Amino acid sequence: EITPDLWQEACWIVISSYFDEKGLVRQQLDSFDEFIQMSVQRIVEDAPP
Amino acid sequence: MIIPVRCFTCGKIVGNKWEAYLGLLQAEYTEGDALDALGLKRYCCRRMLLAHVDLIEKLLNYAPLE
Amino acid sequence: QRTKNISAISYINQRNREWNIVESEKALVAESHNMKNQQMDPFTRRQCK
Amino acid sequence: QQPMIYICGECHTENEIKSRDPIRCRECGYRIMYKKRTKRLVVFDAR
Ligand SMILES: [Zn+2]
Ligand SMILES: [Zn+2]
């Protein structure tokens, strides 16, 4: 059921869930992990014999 | 990092009221009522208990030995 | 080591945040209830077209 | 006769370290250790 006029509070629960699941610096960690996960393997594989 | 000893503006001793304030908040009271239950009339001395952050706990987590 | 103080502080924090959540919810329901009239000078909102 | 006692990093155990010696804890073996407070007349004014 829709949430009329009781929405200031419900608006910040979603924000809290987001900031709990993903940190403030999550982009840095994700980028570095993706690097260490795929980029290195890609670079070492695509290099010619 | 620790509750001050005196109210900066007023000077009334507030250091000896942190444990009491926590107990009063814990049992049932609310802040606005606990504060005047302790006897903090002037709004200058209330900021001591409302705004104060308790970091000494985090500091004690780093036990030197054992 | 944390039986006293270190645990009581956490207990008071959790109960206080729960009390704040319920306080916010009761404030929201009360704000919804008292919908008789809203005539205030210092507030405004855009209305295009 | 002061052998320059040190405090191990994690053991928090005293050690006797002299010059021209490796810096390690008597047990476990770590590479970090701090010094002990002086014995001087540390006097502050509660001002
Ligand atoms: Zn004051
Ligand atoms: Zn060692």
TrEMBL record, chain A:
The chain holds residues 93 to 141 of 1251 of the full protein. RNA-dependent RNA polymerase that catalyzes the extension of a non-coding RNA (ncRNA) at the 3'-end using the four ribonucleoside triphosphates as substrates. An internal ncRNA sequence near the 3'-end serves as a template in a single-round Pol II-mediated RNA polymerization reaction. May decrease the stability of ncRNAs that repress Pol II-mediated gene transcription. Signal peptide: none annotated. It comes from Sus scrofa (Pig). It comes from the Eukaryota. It is found in: Nucleus. This is DNA-directed RNA polymerase subunit beta. Belongs to the RNA polymerase beta chain family.
From TrEMBL, chain D:
Keywords: DNA-directed RNA polymerase, Metal-binding, Nucleus, Transcription, Zinc, Zinc-finger. GO terms for molecular function: DNA binding; DNA-directed RNA polymerase activity; zinc ion binding. Zn(2+) 1 binds at residues 8, 11, 25, 28. The keyword Zinc-finger applies. Zn(2+) 2 binds at residues 8, 28. GO terms for biological process: transcription by RNA polymerase II. The keyword Repeat does not apply. Zn(2+) 3 binds at residue 30. Its main location: nucleus. It is found in: Nucleus, Nucleolus. Belongs to the archaeal Rpo12/eukaryotic RPC10 RNA polymerase subunit family. DNA-dependent RNA polymerase catalyzes the transcription of DNA into RNA using the four ribonucleoside triphosphates as substrates. Common component of RNA polymerases I, II and III which synthesize ribosomal RNA precursors, mRNA precursors and many functional non-coding RNAs, and a small RNAs, such as 5S rRNA and tRNAs, respectively. This is DNA-directed RNA polymerases I, II, and III subunit RPABC4. It comes from Sus scrofa. The gene is POLR2K. The chain holds residues 12 to 58 of 58 of the full protein.
